[PDB]
Design a protein around this ligand. Structure first.
Ligand SMILES: Nc1ncnc2c1ncn2[C@@H]1O[C@H](COP(=O)(O)OP(=O)(O)OP(=O)(O)O)C[C@H]1O
Ligand code: SF4
Ligand SMILES: [Zn+2]
Ligand SMILES: [Zn+2]
Ligand SMILES: [Zn+2]
Lengths: 512, 495, 86, 39, 97, 158
RNA sequence: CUCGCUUCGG
DNA sequence: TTCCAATTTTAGTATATGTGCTTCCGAAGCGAGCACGGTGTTTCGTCCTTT
DNA sequence: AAAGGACGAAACACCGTGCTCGCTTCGGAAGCACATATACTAAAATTGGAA
């Protein structure tokens, strides 16, 4: 996880600072440790260690546990720090699914980690007073309605709550309050009668205290998986099938957990009645769609029952395996060409195969199929089986069989993606550091206009901003800006491949 | 005006931190990349090739040709490394056992170590105590290896973990799909039935479908070690600062400087005397080129794997020239000196050049008795005393004596052979130049290499040394004859 | 037999395949703008702890004018363990 | 250890190297300090 | 060198070193085995712990931490051989005080 | 035909151009058939069935095209379609048909249809590091570093 | 010169 | 429900393949050094036919 | 006997290749010696089943 550690270091340095990213990296590299040994190994002051630990635990990046002799040990969640990169996607998807009020809610929750409902509604109203104008005030009622709508859809979840001290062991205070999580009040919003209007930044006791909220990234991941499956099946058969499976997944969202080989099965009649009325579809059309999808060699859905007319289920892990396979074949095709992708798909469909059979089945001339096979072997895209005639394992007396292992190749690709995003961030930071001189110069000359905007603002300061030598350097500034934009776009888009690969790797584990 | 920089500090070595170098660090340390398998140029001058072995950017080994990296002669050049890229990763023989051990410790699928959380915490707490010794580290590694080999399934990803063993030479086999006498697992049945196409096209696969376990070639082992979490690295008893698991498999070879591999130009014939390391490096580069050519030309998998095994064997022989599991058809013809051979043995660096080494300012002569000498005195021949010199520093006490010694010169016995000036360190041979002027210009602090005179403390030894009295310090008295003479009462200690 | 090479291979060997052009649309550009906004706003956020500047040359009457002032968030010490109060 | 001292070319700790020698130079530790007028 | 025909010097074998150790003569042992046989002055980088040349460390691409150090030449040969064997000896230097 | 000859080999030479043209023509025919089936929009079952093309049918279409002089058997076009399947562009299903104009496999006929890819190219290949051939040697401080990497230089300049 | 081999000496 | 019988599981416990060692100098000398297999190109000497 | 144009051969670089013509093929271990891990085996313990 060296690439993961490097990416976490870059993210923490970009997002929180230096004295805190050191603590985060030390925790990730060394695991759970008490505070004093962390301070000793890091080599910084105890106060800085405490500040870093509290700011990290505020954003739910680290957790603390009690052990023998009442010592508290802090363990970092590397996966959570990596999930920090999906924040733009989280905000965009909550802006798509809801109004911009929910977008601001999720943005505040992600930027603050843990907050109270009153705090989030106050901040959202204050920020939204800027969006509108002409004296219109932002009321807490609609913000609370959007917040509870997010809560019932499991996008925002209550943070683990400290147990009551008076009822639980009244007496000496423990070193750590041992926060526990209760699913009863997991998504129960408090009843807050207070309302108000956000201030317009003129610059001229808490009923829900103790109830902290956060963003439920698991719900976002489930929604992203549903979106990916819907997009895939839309690309495969038709938009009608995409809508059908989208409705089935929407029904399955609540009644199933986040990790199951199959969802709860559905009957044809409830799919028909739950489908949006905008589609002029009869019952027999839906049954035809269900049975033709059931016969798809991708096995996105399955019958798995006959009662209630057309009884159907959705294969989640099979769909994720198919998506990971598609990602692997796409990266192979784009890195080595369509012929190499043909060889890769051939050796994937045929579980084990030899060179002569590959040449016979691919219609690819010799000295080129072998070369591409060796190239893919050099990049761990497949492994040799090497069935030996004798235990001596001599190359002359054994058969070599090509076989693609989806799991190992997916892990390799995920590691490569981690290092790729790390390199993109490093390049962006290097360009920013090398052009910070022109950045400061242009910040000064533009702040000349930004200062004295209206008060004492004579027009004679508008023809001299471009007078300085910054004008020929504006081309370098534009190149820097477009390079940063492209790097950020690519860094964001590689995150989708990371999400698909990570979901596939997670869903193939048993955690026994 | 002038920046204050410290000239020299009396730095003393405190301790040596052993470790390993990653392939990136090898490139950073090295100066050039060696890609040419030939040594000298085609022309009759036979100058060493550029970017090949014996390139003088890696130091120099001849008194006439200076180093190209640092413009210094053979005496002053410390030597510089190079790096050779390997087309296919190869197991480091010295760490091979360690590799196997690590492969036993960790999961073969999710790369996590086979330890429960409670056992993880217990071992971390046991390792966190200060003052951990090397023996304690080895014992802890043994205990952790035993407790990890106790388990057979993964607590992290749930994948099965069979036994990992060394089959053949430098080959690791993992018994992932072991035969189950009881009810068979779905995984092994699926693996067995996945060979349908191979059986259809080749029937011989079906009888040999057994014993078909996972083979951990260096590529897969390197890929797995690159995914080991850094948290579990200390649990492998390996220091994170010293090295990483990915360093155990070598993909770059640090070709040593020319000082380690002297080359002798035997102009009497059309050839040169080269040590075994240069030839092994030449063979390794040739194998890399051959493997690249075979990959380009579309060769069979059997010969590709044969070339990979040949490269692994050549790397192992380059590191250790005395292996055991070498196949007879793959056995070396003659005998080569690997690094292990250069290190170990009675003529190795430790025993032949580090613990006991040859010295100058010494002589060896037949002895004869002389009872007229005191027991603390030894008679030294005049001829030897004229050769063995002592550097006497000029002070206010011996100036009038060293003046006479300088005046005598290198011929008369009481005298000197060299004068080293205080200001400039240029030695002056006393056989040439006006010796009277040099004696008149003897400044305080000058070093005079005087002849061995009466009263000099001199070590005297009989080479088969049994007890500490076999070597003693005597007072030298110069005598006209040619033998070392001492009182016979001192015969018994020297035997 | 393979040929002998006089110069090492180029540090960056050329590739005849180039990266696929980035996805475009209103959503992707909104993602880019939102990420830049997060960068600009979370550095001024009090959670971003700066390195404490030290070794002031002298004290001056202008210090009060140049004194950096920033509101500080107060952690909820009820959830946080006792060891991290200042 | 002695053997590593020999290999590294440093005086070994046993024997005459156990102790350290000091020079009995005419000196005055903690000499008087010139007073600071401005502070 | 080894022999009289090649004008070689005498050899302090292992037992001679053992006898010198038994006497406790540390200074004479150091002078015989280091000063008079294979004394050398190398440049060690105090940051990376590796050997530099001419007051310059190529690994760190710097010259601030390079310090001179007296050492037997055979020890330098051993260190370079170990580096070639991927057994990297990193020297942590310190002041003689 | 195995030890010598074959419809692809001409004088001990594999014909890459011939197989490329065969792939192009077969894929164009399958794509046109799928487009017509989609535009028909009569019924999803009938749409999928009409999008399906028999191996005998596409072989007859190829023979009608007559690109090359060598006679192409039905299994030759079957192998070409199998290679197209391995290219990830067409999909084959074995349906039950006792006898008909094909009559090739006993009670089974292979139907081929042009099918779209599952997903667009992934985000990884949209970055130079995802396609870098010296990705292993890339390091923060060294000769090959992202700060001085040529691939991102060309990519951002382009 | 390097390396090995022998013969010595003790 | 519970005593016996059977199966498994791990652990320990005896042999038998590996790797590792085997005095300190010192002195001469003799050998022989990486190659050699066949293939091509160049240089040179002479089987007749010519004064 | 003195010629000279063309032919043949012979001797030295040269590259494909790996010191052995063909593919085989032996013997001997050198001894004292602490590891190993394999295979076994064995008992003891736990769980299933007859009464
Ligand atoms: N191999 C050896 N190792 C160590 N010392 C040796 C060796 N060979 C000879 N010497 C030296 O020679 C001496 C041996 O002489 P020693 O055995 O006592 O008398 P000797 O040779 O039996 O004479 P006599 O036969 O008694 O007249 C002692 C030792 O310092
Ligand atoms: S930074 Fe450059 S060299 Fe490194 S992986 Fe990315 S593209 Fe390749
Ligand atoms: Zn040099
Ligand atoms: Zn695992
Ligand atoms: Zn350095």
């Amino acid at each position: 996880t060296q690439a993961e550690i490097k990416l976490c270091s870059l993210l923490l340095q970009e997002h929180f600072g230096e004295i805190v990213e050191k603590i985060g990296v030390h925790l990730i590299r060394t695991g759970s440790q008490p505070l004093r040994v962390i301070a000793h190994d890091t080599g910084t002051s105890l106060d800085q260690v405490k500040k870093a630990l509290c700011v990290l635990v505020q954003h739910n990046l680290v957790s603390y546990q009690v052990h023998k002799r009442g010592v508290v040990e802090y363990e970092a969640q590397c996966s959570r720090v990596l999930r920090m990169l999906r924040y733009p996607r989280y905000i965009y998807t909550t802006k798509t699914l809801y109004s911009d009020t929910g977008e601001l809610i999720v943005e505040e929750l992600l930027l603050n980690g843990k907050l109270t409902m009153s705090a989030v509604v106050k901040k959202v109203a204050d920020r939204l007073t800027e969006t509108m104008e002409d004296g219109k005030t932002m009321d807490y009622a609609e913000v609370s309605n959007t917040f509870v709508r997010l809560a019932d859809t499991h996008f925002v979840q209550r943070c683990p709550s400290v147990p009551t001290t008076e009822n639980s062991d009244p007496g000496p205070p423990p070193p750590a309050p041992t926060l526990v999580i209760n699913e009863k009040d997991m998504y129960l919003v408090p009843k807050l009668s207070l309302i108000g209007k956000g201030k317009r930044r003129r610059s001229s006791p808490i009923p829900d205290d103790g109830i902290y909220w956060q963003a439920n990234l698991d719900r976002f991941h489930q929604h992203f998986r549903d979106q990916a499956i819907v997009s895939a099946v839309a690309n495969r058969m038709d938009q009608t099938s995409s809508e059908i499976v989208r409705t089935m997944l929407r029904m399955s969202e609540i009644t199933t957990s986040s990790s199951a080989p199959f969802t709860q099965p559905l009957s044809s009649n409830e799919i028909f009645r739950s489908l949006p009325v905008g589609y002029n579809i009869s019952k027999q059309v839906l049954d035809q769609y269900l049975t033709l999808l059931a016969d798809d060699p991708l096995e996105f859905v399955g019958k798995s029952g006959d009662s209630g007319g057309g009884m159907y289920v959705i294969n989640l892990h099979k769909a994720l395996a198919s998506l990971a396979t598609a990602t692997l074949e796409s990266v192979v095709q784009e890195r080595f060409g369509s012929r190499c992708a043909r060889i890769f798909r051939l050796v994937l469909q045929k579980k084990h195969i030899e060179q002569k059979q590959v040449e016979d089945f691919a219609m690819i001339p010799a000295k080129e199929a072998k070369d591409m096979l060796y190239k893919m072997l050099s990049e761990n895209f497949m492994s040799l089986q090497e069935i030996p005639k004798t235990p001596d394992h001599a190359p002359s007396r054994t058969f070599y069989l090509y076989t693609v292992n989806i799991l190992s190749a997916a892990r390799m690709l995920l590691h490569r993606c981690y290092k790729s995003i790390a390199n993109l961030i490093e390049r962006r930071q290097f360009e920013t550091k090398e052009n910070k001189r022109l950045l400061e110069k242009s910040q000064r000359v533009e702040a000349i206009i930004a200062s004295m905007q209206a008060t004492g603002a004579e027009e004679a300061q508008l023809q001299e901003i471009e007078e300085m030598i910054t004008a020929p350097e504006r081309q370098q500034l534009e190149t820097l800006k477009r390079n940063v934009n492209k790097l950020d776009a690519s860094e964001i888009q590689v995150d989708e491949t990371i999400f698909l690969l990570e979901s596939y790797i997670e869903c193939t584990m048993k955690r026994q | 005006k002038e920046q204050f920089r410290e000239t020299d500090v009396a730095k003393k070595i405190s301790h040596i931190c052993f470790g390993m170098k990653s392939p990136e660090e090898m490139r950073q340390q090295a100066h050039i990349q060696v890609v040419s398998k030939n040594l000298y140029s085609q022309d009759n001058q036979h100058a060493p090739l550029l970017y090949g072995v014996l390139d003088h950017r890696m130091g120099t080994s001849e008194k006439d040709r200076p180093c190209e990296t640092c413009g210094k002669n053979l005496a002053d050049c410390l030597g510089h490394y190079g790096y050779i890229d390997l087309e296919l990763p190869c197991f480091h023989v010295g760490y091979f056992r360690a590799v196997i051990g690590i492969l036993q410790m960790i999961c073969k699928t999710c790369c996590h170590i086979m330890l429960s959380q409670e056992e993880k915490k217990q071992f971390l707490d046991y390792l966190k105590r200060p003052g951990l010794t090397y023996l304690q580290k080895r014992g802890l590694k043994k205990k952790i290896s035993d407790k990890c080999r106790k388990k057979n399934i993964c607590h992290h990803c749930g994948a099965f973990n069979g036994t990992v063993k060394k089959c053949g030479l430098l080959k690791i086999i993992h018994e992932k799909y072991k035969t189950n006498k009881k009810v068979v697992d779905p995984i092994v049945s699926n693996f067995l039935q996945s060979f349908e196409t191979a059986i259809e096209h080749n029937k011989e696969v079906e009888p040999l479908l057994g014993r078909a376990q996972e083979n951990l070639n260096p590529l897969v082992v390197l890929n797995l070690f690159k995914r080991i979490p850094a948290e579990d690295v200390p649990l492998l008893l390996m220091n994170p600062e010293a090295g990483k698991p990915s360093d155990l498999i070598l993909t770059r070879l640090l070709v040593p400087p020319l000082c380690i591999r002297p080359s002798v130009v035997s102009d009497l014939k059309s050839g040169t005397n080269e040590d075994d390391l240069t030839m092994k490096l030449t063979e390794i580069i040739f194998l890399n080129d051959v493997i690249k050519k075979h990959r380009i030309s579309g060769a069979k998998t059997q010969m590709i794997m044969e070339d990979w095994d040949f490269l692994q064997l050549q790397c192992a022989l380059y590191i250790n020239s005395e292996l055991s599991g070498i196949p007879l058809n793959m056995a070396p013809k003659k005998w080569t000196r690997g690094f292990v051979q250069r290190l170990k043995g009675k003529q190795g660096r430790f025993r032949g050049n580090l613990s006991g080494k040859r010295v100058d300012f010494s002589g060896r002569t037949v002895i004869s008795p002389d009872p007229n000498l005191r027991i603390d005195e030894v008679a030294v021949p005049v001829h030897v005393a004229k050769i063995l010199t002592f550097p006497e520093k000029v002070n206010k006490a011996n100036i009038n004596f060293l003046r006479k010694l300088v005046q005598n010169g290198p011929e008369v016995h009481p005298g000197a052979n060299f004068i080293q000036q205080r200001h400039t360190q240029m030695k002056r041979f006393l056989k040439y130049g006006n010796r009277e002027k040099m004696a008149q210009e003897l400044k305080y602090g000058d070093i005079v290499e005087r002849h061995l005179i009466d009263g000099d403390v001199v070590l005297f030894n009989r080479q088969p040394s049994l007890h500490k009295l076999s070597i003693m310090a005597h007072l030298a008295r110069v005598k006209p004859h040619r033998t070392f003479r001492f009182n016979e009462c001192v015969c018994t200690p020297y035997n | 037999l393979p040929d002998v090479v006089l110069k090492p291979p180029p540090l960056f060997p050329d590739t005849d395949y180039k990266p696929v052009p980035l996805k475009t649309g209103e959503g992707e550009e909104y993602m880019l703008a939102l990420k830049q906004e997060l960068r600009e706003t979370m550095k001024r956020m009090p959670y971003f702890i700066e390195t404490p500047e030290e070794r002031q040359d002298i004290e001056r009457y202008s210090k009060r004018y140049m004194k950096v002032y920033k509101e500080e968030w107060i952690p909820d010490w009820r959830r946080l363990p006792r060891e991290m109060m200042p | 250890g002695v053997s590593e001292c020999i290999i590294m070319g440093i005086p070994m700790n046993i024997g005459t190297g156990l102790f350290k020698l000091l020079h009995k130079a005419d000196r005055d530790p903690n000499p008087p300090k010139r007073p600071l007028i401005f502070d | 060198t080894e022999g009289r025909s090649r004008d070689g010097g005498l050899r302090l074998g292992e037992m001679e070193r053992d006898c010198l150790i038994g006497y406790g003569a540390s200074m004479l042992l150091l002078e015989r085995l280091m000063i008079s046989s294979d004394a050398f002055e190398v440049d060690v980088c105090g940051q990376c712990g590796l050997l530099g040349y001419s007051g310059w460390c190529h690994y760190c691409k710097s010259s601030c931490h390079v310090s001179s150090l007296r050492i037997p030449y055979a020890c330098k040969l051993l260190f370079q051989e170990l580096q070639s064997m991927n057994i990297i000896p990193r020297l942590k230097l310190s002041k003689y005080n | 035909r195995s030890v010598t000859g074959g419809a692809w080999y001409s004088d001990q030479d594999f014909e890459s151009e011939f197989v490329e043209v065969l792939n192009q023509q077969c894929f164009k025919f399958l794509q046109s058939k799928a487009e017509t089936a989609r535009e028909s929009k009569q019924n999803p079952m009938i749409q999928r069935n009409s999008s399906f093309a028999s191996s005998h049918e596409v072989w007859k279409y190829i023979c009608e095209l007559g690109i090359s002089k060598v006679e192409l058997s039905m299994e030759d076009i079957e192998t070409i379609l199998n290679t197209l399947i391995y290219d990830g562009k067409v999909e084959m299903t074995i349906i039950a048909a006792k006898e008909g104009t094909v009559g090739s496999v006993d009670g089974h006929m292979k139907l081929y249809r042009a099918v779209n890819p599952i997903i667009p190219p992934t985000g990884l290949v949209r970055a130079p590091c995802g396609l870098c051939p010296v990705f292993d040697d890339c390091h923060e401080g060294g000769e090959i570093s992202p700060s001085n990497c040529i691939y991102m230089t060309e990519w951002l300049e382009f």
